[PDB]
């Protein structure tokens, strides 16, 4: 039961960018990235304004009476344990992203500084990175993750993003001009969003290899590294099961090694001192950073935001469908309040520690003179931070392998989700159609890395913002659909009608 | 049934300042404005400290159990629709004030800067203006608006500010040393508060005319512009009814034209980018600006505050009686929570957009070189912002007419309120006594504009702070009376006594 | 019934530091203060991170359902009146501390400035002092004060800090590797914490005398001033009762005189203008100061924090046992919510006014040129602020006497608490064992002032951070024990079970309606098909 109504237009746009970028109209793709700077100028306020709205909206709901509502049958107990649920939360907290920017981002802000602040500022350097990897991102994943976890568990609808727009569009009739389109953009936004992490994984590994087999052009090398792990996703999907479960555990171990290694070896105390700093400062500059637009100070932030804030915002939106589908399944029959409150606190905890370790020591070195700053190369900075520590050559390989495993897990999980959306929300997607999207995502992966050539990272970040632009309004509209569904929920109505009886009972007696 | 006990002392003080200012002791009036700088030094902390207290106090009540209480009969449904109620909220959001400072204020802060911050700072420039036209002002209007809407709807007392002090002063016995005095100051504070907006409307129009009939002295011109609309308030009160209803609708349209025109024509994107900025930054610098006193940094803010923060604070207080009487009638039998939460959110929404458009583009031009800064003239800056845009000469006239309509609506509405306070809270005041206060307010209007002459704006802002000083403590005390009334409501009071 | 199990190890460590500091290994004591800078480097984040946690934790509990719980018998009415309870709250708000730093602290921040800010900044100068004497300190006193006031009133256990760890350690079995140790550290942390205030009282008075009998070496003078009030604590404990009650009232009067005097005489308006400033600014820089560590800006704050933030934090922790025992008795059968909400608001109100008056005028003078800055001497700055005002020579003596009374009240109250912990939580401690700890505390008092010599203040602040380090984790663990006790309360456990049954009953009733509408629906489909 393959819904080709979504598959066709999806692959059409997917393969389009692939061919229109990999070759022929190569320089034309980089022209679209230039005309893309227009969306940052126009819909710039959109990503920023609503970007914070997601945080307030998801907190208001969690705090309101809707929080008591169970995600499924009335008064249903969660399947997985409380601790087990939190453990699966860390699995989502770790990704190729933290491996990439985790060490560079906090450093680039300490060296260059952020719009409206002095340079060499530890406090602001952390508050910014925190502002990009904590509440805001997960506030978007919670909205989507809740929109699904409610419509498919509580109401009992199909596992399609369109099924969440039932209240708005039309009950069951949401399969015309919209609905299908929502499911179409859902896949397109996901394939590009995942292609980003996969692409970042390539440059990350490539720069890691340029720190082992020194040296080689490395143009073909990129195509190699990609297909290497791209081919080993099949033997971890079809012929072999339990791939996501096993590899995820291995990832947590390797990620724990790097985190601990840098922690004990590097400036331990300094890292620990950053825990209260990054956290406290984050709460201080929150609204100041939330009000940061291309008008402060004097339209100077425009360039900065477009390559940082605006980027992440779009990158999370394009990734919301995947993370949403994930958090939904993990939170079976779990209170809305504990679901939201658990999605914003647990993951945000990992991002805090991770950045305080890598992005922390990287700053400590910048202070002591041993600048890890690899002449700009963001990918070479993670390994540079390792080689600067006793046993760096070793951990450098471990971190490199961890990337290869992430590339597989990320692509695997993202594929099982995309395949589901292509099968009318079938929970048990075929390991064949799943692998199909696997190469389809990696295809767009290299296409973005080759079109940019030397500026692969520049073009990669750009294309991401493109596919996310349309899906942005989807999440904004998904915000209303989630409000109407709740306002028409059994427990909710039963509450307002029971409260109206209590406010009328002691009224007549008076 | 005219309560002359309040009328006499009111007109006595009103006409006093009129004559003692319009002529004879002219230079003596400007001497009182100098000795007025003493109230900014002494009671300076009062306006600032409590100024924020109003915000916390009105939010705590709205959040507390008192919020569930209906403004009238137990479990009574509001008269007007939810959307209709919000629409009437915008009618109060729009005024002569936004037309005046809406374009200049955000600019003067971007050019000169605020105490304790660098200049040419967009973020701080917005946070400040927001700090003056959002929560704080309406937190004062909500307290008064609720004090009335409760005492006259719930309890069922007369529509007099003194009737709200029943819990404190004395039940029904609040008509001696106090009560009447509270009603006296209520009118005096209102007539001066309204005279400010009317005065600002004059200078605004006058500067608009100096951009059409260029040129003429303009001394008599001011007296003309005023009496022109001052005489057409009668034909919109007595001989003609539905004045407030019709004109209010026309005001919203014209105000929508200016707002949209500048929005689409000017830097659209920039304006939109200021929505998250002004809002976000406002929440960031809130407590920092709330703690801003004449001691930071190093008693340097004293001069700045006295001509900005301290000013608005007094200007809102002197206007609280009017806005309070208004919001009360509009919110018939409406939950206290939705009343407060609706008074702080709806109007504050307009002020955000309005300042992000006019005060926004004005900054965008300041950045691009086309400084609209009309050599200091605040009134000439609004029109300068228009003439800088395609079709400015047209909108300049539209905005000018909109001011004339505001001058009438503001004076009309303010009069119907003052007349009510002079008739033992009679909801249906006479269209004759109403028009009486009409000229009485405009009288003080010109008196403040002529006494200053060239510094008409300087003297106008000053006299305002004077009449508000006494009423300040009234609102502070009105804060306690609103707490006792609520703590002694219906089911709540009886429940405590039954537990005693 | 003296619990020597705690007394012995306590006096052993107490007398140890006394002898090992007063003489012989004198320079060795100052060596421990150098190796002490290591705890500020290592556990530095601990004091800062959790330091704010205490604030959030104590606010969450007060806001939660636990707040409705009464501190004693179910639905028990408080003994003292609401106003009387607030009055006894001010008695705790006033101390030797405010007399010492109240005038200097806000000044040193206006002159030198704080890490990450410009100098001569009034706003930041107040926010910092506020950050040290408001929520944070009392958030620690509330946690301890509640841990006791609940375990001894509600549950009905002995008045020992160890009795509060019953949930964690073991029910009644908390008297082995732990428990006793918790009671041991409780006294040690208290004796050192009190010794600080007593020591500060000495230097304060000594500098006051150097402003009257000008002049004299003053080395022996310190030993005199101390023993003078140290000997008059006995005649105010044994031979005379009602000492704490009477003197406390006298302290409030004298403290009111100084506060008002400086208020009316000095820059009145300026002080009043600081009320909104200090308060407002405090809320603004709260999280910014809460995130202040030895990494901002660029590990430069390390030195500053170690001599300010880190100090107070440890000083409050080492004093938590005493203040906790106090607030507990004062809040008999009083709602947890009104207890916490009353401990964080009332005292924080005094600290705001006190600093806005003394620390306020001191800045006003610094602005007008008449710098009260007594060439660094912190003790000579309070009197300098007085002598600068009409009738300073008079108030200088009054403030000096007020210090002597505080020295007695502080030592007296601290002793009655330490003695209680040495008698299995006996509420009625002996006036003999109480006086015993009196000299025991003053002993460590002079020991810290003589070991430093010229840098008496430097060494005094250091030794304090030492004894508090271990007790820090005790308060962190006491945070968990307070959560388990509450989660297992009668009124509480009834509230949850009730909230469940009420949700199951409604659950059942709803299911029956869905089958009702479904049965009734398909029924009308047969009436229309067969009409």
From Swiss-Prot, chain B:
Cytoplasmic face of the membrane: 64-81, 151-180, 239-241, 329-338, 419-431
Full-sequence portion shown in this chain: 57 to 558 of 595
Record protein name field: Glycine betaine transporter BetP
Result when mutating residue 311 to G: Decreases affinity for glycine betaine. Decreases betaine transport
Impact reported for residue 141 to L: Nearly abolishes betaine transport
Amino acids binding Na(+) 1: 91, 248, 252
Variant or mutagenesis effect after changing residue 304 to C: Strongly decreased betaine transport
Source taxonomy: Bacteria, Bacillati, Actinomycetota, Actinomycetes, Mycobacteriales
Protein's organism: Corynebacterium glutamicum (strain ATCC 13032 / DSM 20300 / JCM 1318 / BCRC 11384 / CCUG 27702 / LMG 3730 / NBRC 12168 / NCIMB 10025 / NRRL B-2784 / 534)
Binding site for Na(+) 2: 92, 94
Induction pattern: Constitutively expressed at a basal level of activity. Induced upon hyperosmotic conditions, resulting in an increase of its transport activity.
Residues in the Periplasmic compartment per record: 25-42, 103-129, 202-218, 266-307, 360-393, 453-462
Activity sensitivity to pH: Optimum pH is 7.5-8.5.
Places the protein is found: Cell inner membrane
Segments passing through the bilayer: 4-24, 43-63, 82-102, 130-150, 181-201, 219-238, 242-265, 308-328, 339-359, 394-418, 432-452, 463-483
Membrane topology label: Multi-pass membrane protein
Result of changing residue 316 to L: No effect on betaine transport
């Amino acid at each position: 039961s393959l819904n080709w109504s979504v598959i066709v237009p999806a692959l059409v746009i997917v393969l389009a960018t692939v061919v229109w970028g990999i070759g022929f109209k190569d320089s034309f793709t980089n022209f679209a990235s230039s005309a893309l700077s227009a969306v940052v100028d126009n819909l710039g306020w959109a990503f920023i304004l609503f970007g914070t709205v997601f945080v307030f909206f998801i907190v208001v709901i969690a705090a309101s009476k809707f929080g008591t509502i169970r995600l499924g049958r009335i008064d249903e107990a969660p399947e997985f344990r409380t601790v087990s649920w939190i453990s699966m939360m860390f699995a989502a907290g770790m990704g190729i992203g933290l491996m990439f920017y985790g060490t560079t981002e906090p450093l680039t802000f300490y060296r260059n500084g952020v719009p409206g602040h002095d340079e060499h500022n530890v406090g602001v350097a952390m508050s910014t990175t925190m502002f990009h990897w904590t509440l805001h991102p997960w506030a978007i994943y919670a909205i989507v993750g809740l929109a699904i976890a409610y419509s498919t568990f509580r109401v009992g609808r199909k596992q399609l993003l369109s099924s969440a727009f039932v209240p708005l569009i039309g009950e069951k009739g949401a399969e015309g001009w919209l609905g299908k389109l929502i499911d179409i953009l859902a896949i397109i936004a996901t394939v590009f969003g995942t292609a980003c992490s996969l692409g970042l994984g390539a440059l990350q590994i490539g720069a890691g290899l340029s720190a082992a087999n020194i040296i080689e052009s490395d143009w073909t090398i990129v195509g190699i590294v990609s297909v290497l792990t791209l081919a080993f996703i099949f033997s971890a999907i079809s012929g072999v099961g339990k791939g996501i479960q096993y590899l995820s555990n291995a990832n947590m171990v390797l990620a724990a090694l790097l985190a601990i290694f840098v922690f004990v070896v590097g400036p331990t105390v300094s890292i620990l001192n950053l825990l209260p700093g990054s956290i406290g400062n984050y709460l201080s500059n929150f609204f100041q950073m939330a009000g940061r637009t291309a008008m402060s100070a004097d339209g100077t932030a425009g360039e900065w935001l477009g390559s940082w804030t605006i980027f992440y915002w779009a990158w999370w939106i394009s990734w919301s469908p995947f993370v949403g589908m994930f958090l939904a399944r993990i939170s079976r029959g779990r209170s809305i309040r504990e679901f939201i409150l658990g999605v914003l606190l647990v993951p945000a905890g990992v991002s805090t520690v991770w950045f305080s370790i890598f992005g922390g020591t990287a700053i400590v070195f910048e202070q002591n003179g041993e600048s890890i700053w690899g002449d700009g190369a963001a990918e070479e900075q993670l390994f540079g931070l390792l080689h600067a520590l006793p046993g760096g050559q070793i951990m450098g390989i471990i971190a490199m392998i961890l990337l290869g495993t992430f590339f597989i897990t990320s692509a695997d999980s993202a594929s099982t989700v995309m395949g589901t959306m292509s099968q009318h929300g079938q929970l048990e997607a075929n390991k064949w159609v799943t692998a199909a999207w696997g190469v389809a995502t990696a295809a767009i992966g290299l296409t973005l890395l080759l079109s940019g050539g030397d500026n692969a990272l520049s073009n990669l970040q750009n294309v991401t913002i493109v596919a996310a632009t349309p899906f942005l309004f989807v999440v904004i509209g998904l915000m209303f659909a989630l409000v109407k569904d709740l306002s028409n929920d059994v427990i909710y109505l039963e509450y307002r009608e029971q409260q109206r009886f209590n406010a009328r009972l002691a009224r007549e007696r008076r």
